[PDB]
Amino acid sequence: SANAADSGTLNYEVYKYNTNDTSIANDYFNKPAKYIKKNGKLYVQITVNHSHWITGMSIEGHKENIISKNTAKDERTSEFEVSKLNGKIDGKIDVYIDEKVNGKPFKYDHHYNITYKFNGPTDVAG
Numbered sequence: 001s002a003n004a005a006d007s008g009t010l011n012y013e014v015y016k017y018n019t020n021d022t023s024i025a026n027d028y029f030n031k032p033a034k035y036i037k038k039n040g041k042l043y044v045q046i047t048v049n050h051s052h053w054i055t056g057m058s059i060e061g062h063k064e065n066i067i068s069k070n071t072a073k074d075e076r077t078s079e080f081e082v083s084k085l086n087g088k089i090d091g092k093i094d095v096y097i098d099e100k101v102n103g104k105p106f107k108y109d110h111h112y113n114i115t116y117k118f119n120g121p122t123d124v125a126g
């Protein structure tokens, strides 16, 4: 990497809200994720698995930004702003689905949430 630092694949994960073990969202988020900074700031791009299932996501209490929605490969991405990236933050997400799962009409349309977990530097400022 050169002529464009402040960016790379940082470690990160998520967990079931109200618990401490990922139980659902963990099956739709690949890893690791790509974090990025800008002298006194930083964000992170998350990979979205199957858009037809996940309608969007939010971290720290704000919506996400469409950075790269690939419909051909069914993979979207979104950038999130958060204080550094070494712990976890209360994020949220929306979902929307409507189809028969193997002969079973499955309806889904609400605003669920999940615990985010970033893993990278911490201070690095003397």
Ligand code: ZNH
Pocket (backbone or CB within 6 Å): 024, 025, 026, 028, 053, 054, 093, 095, 097, 106, 108, 112, 113, 114
């Ligand atoms: C598509 C297919 C699908 C299905 C069928 C489902 C289903 C479901 C169910 C049934 C539930 C409930 C459970 C109990 O009752 O306990 C849930 C939840 C759920 N979910 Zn989900 N999902 C899904 C997807 C999904 C996704 C994609 C996501 C994102 C990533 C999610 C996220 C979720 C969450 C977060 C939750 C939690 C909510 C509660 O619990 O409240 N999810 N989910």
